[PDB]
Amino acid sequence: GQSRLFLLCHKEALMKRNFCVPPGASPEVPKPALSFYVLGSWLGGTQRKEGTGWGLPEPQGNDDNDQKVHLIFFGSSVRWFEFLHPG
């Protein structure tokens, strides 16, 4: 198994959105779909599964880019909406 920790900062609303054309996909306009995304900051490197528990985190990437990530939720992952809160 693989894991990574992140701290939630702000959560957008849940509404119908029109996705972008995927890179290299067919030039067909996507149908509107229910989706939302959150903005969160990573707290460390990737952690590898170690039996029941998890191993020590890998060293954080020496990247000058800000430790910020966008997590786009859609499809069948929309069920996590009510379990996410800032802080």
Short mmCIF file of C-alpha atoms in Angstrom, two decimals:
data_model
loop_
_atom_site.label_atom_id
_atom_site.label_comp_id
_atom_site.label_asym_id
_atom_site.label_seq_id
_atom_site.Cartn_x
_atom_site.Cartn_y
_atom_site.Cartn_z
CA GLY A 1 0.00 0.00 0.00
CA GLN A 2 0.89 3.66 -0.50
CA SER A 3 -0.09 6.73 1.49
CA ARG A 4 0.59 10.45 1.88
CA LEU A 5 -0.57 12.98 4.47
CA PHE A 6 -2.09 16.35 3.58
CA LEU A 7 -3.68 19.16 5.58
CA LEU A 8 -6.97 20.59 4.31
CA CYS A 9 -7.24 24.35 3.82
CA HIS A 10 -10.38 25.19 1.83
CA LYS A 11 -13.15 23.17 0.19
CA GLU A 12 -15.14 24.35 -2.83
CA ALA A 13 -18.87 23.85 -3.26
CA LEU A 14 -20.54 20.80 -4.80
CA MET A 15 -22.23 21.66 -8.10
CA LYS A 16 -22.38 20.71 -11.78
CA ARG A 17 -19.22 21.52 -13.73
CA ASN A 18 -17.98 21.12 -17.29
CA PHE A 19 -14.61 19.36 -17.38
CA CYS A 20 -11.78 20.29 -19.72
CA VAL A 21 -10.82 18.19 -22.73
CA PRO A 22 -8.28 15.60 -21.56
CA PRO A 23 -4.81 15.97 -23.10
CA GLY A 24 -4.80 13.96 -26.31
CA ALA A 25 -8.39 12.73 -25.95
CA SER A 26 -11.15 12.97 -28.54
CA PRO A 27 -12.38 16.54 -29.25
CA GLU A 28 -15.82 15.90 -27.76
CA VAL A 29 -17.47 18.31 -25.33
CA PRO A 30 -17.82 16.57 -21.94
CA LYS A 31 -21.30 16.37 -20.48
CA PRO A 32 -21.86 18.29 -17.22
CA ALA A 33 -20.98 16.20 -14.17
CA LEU A 34 -21.15 16.59 -10.40
CA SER A 35 -17.70 17.41 -9.06
CA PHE A 36 -15.80 19.43 -6.47
CA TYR A 37 -12.19 19.93 -5.42
CA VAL A 38 -10.23 20.95 -2.33
CA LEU A 39 -6.94 22.76 -1.78
CA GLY A 40 -4.53 21.18 0.68
CA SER A 41 -0.89 21.28 1.74
CA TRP A 42 1.26 18.17 2.01
CA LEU A 43 2.77 17.38 5.40
CA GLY A 44 5.61 15.09 4.34
CA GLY A 45 6.93 12.50 1.95
CA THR A 46 5.27 9.34 0.71
CA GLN A 47 4.76 6.60 3.31
CA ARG A 48 5.06 2.92 2.39
CA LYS A 49 2.85 0.26 3.94
CA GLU A 50 4.65 -1.85 6.57
CA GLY A 51 2.36 -4.70 7.57
CA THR A 52 -0.44 -3.39 9.74
CA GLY A 53 1.23 0.01 10.12
CA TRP A 54 3.02 2.40 7.80
CA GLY A 55 6.74 2.89 7.31
CA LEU A 56 8.74 6.00 8.03
CA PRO A 57 8.01 8.76 5.48
CA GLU A 58 10.35 9.13 2.54
CA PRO A 59 12.43 12.34 2.56
CA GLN A 60 10.53 15.35 1.25
CA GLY A 61 11.31 16.28 -2.34
CA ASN A 62 13.86 19.10 -2.57
CA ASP A 63 11.49 21.16 -4.71
CA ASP A 64 11.25 24.94 -4.39
CA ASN A 65 7.61 24.75 -5.51
CA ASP A 66 5.06 25.38 -2.77
CA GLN A 67 3.74 22.24 -1.07
CA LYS A 68 0.22 22.71 -2.43
CA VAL A 69 -1.96 20.29 -4.38
CA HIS A 70 -5.39 20.29 -6.02
CA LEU A 71 -7.53 17.18 -5.44
CA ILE A 72 -10.27 17.06 -8.07
CA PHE A 73 -13.12 14.78 -6.95
CA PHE A 74 -15.73 13.39 -9.35
CA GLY A 75 -17.28 10.13 -10.51
CA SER A 76 -17.95 7.84 -7.55
CA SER A 77 -15.65 9.72 -5.14
CA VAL A 78 -18.26 12.42 -4.42
CA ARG A 79 -19.37 10.49 -1.32
CA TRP A 80 -16.47 12.03 0.66
CA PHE A 81 -17.97 15.54 0.58
CA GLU A 82 -19.52 15.61 4.06
CA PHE A 83 -16.45 14.10 5.78
CA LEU A 84 -14.04 16.88 4.72
CA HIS A 85 -13.67 20.05 6.79
CA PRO A 86 -10.98 22.73 7.06
CA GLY A 87 -8.37 22.39 9.78
#
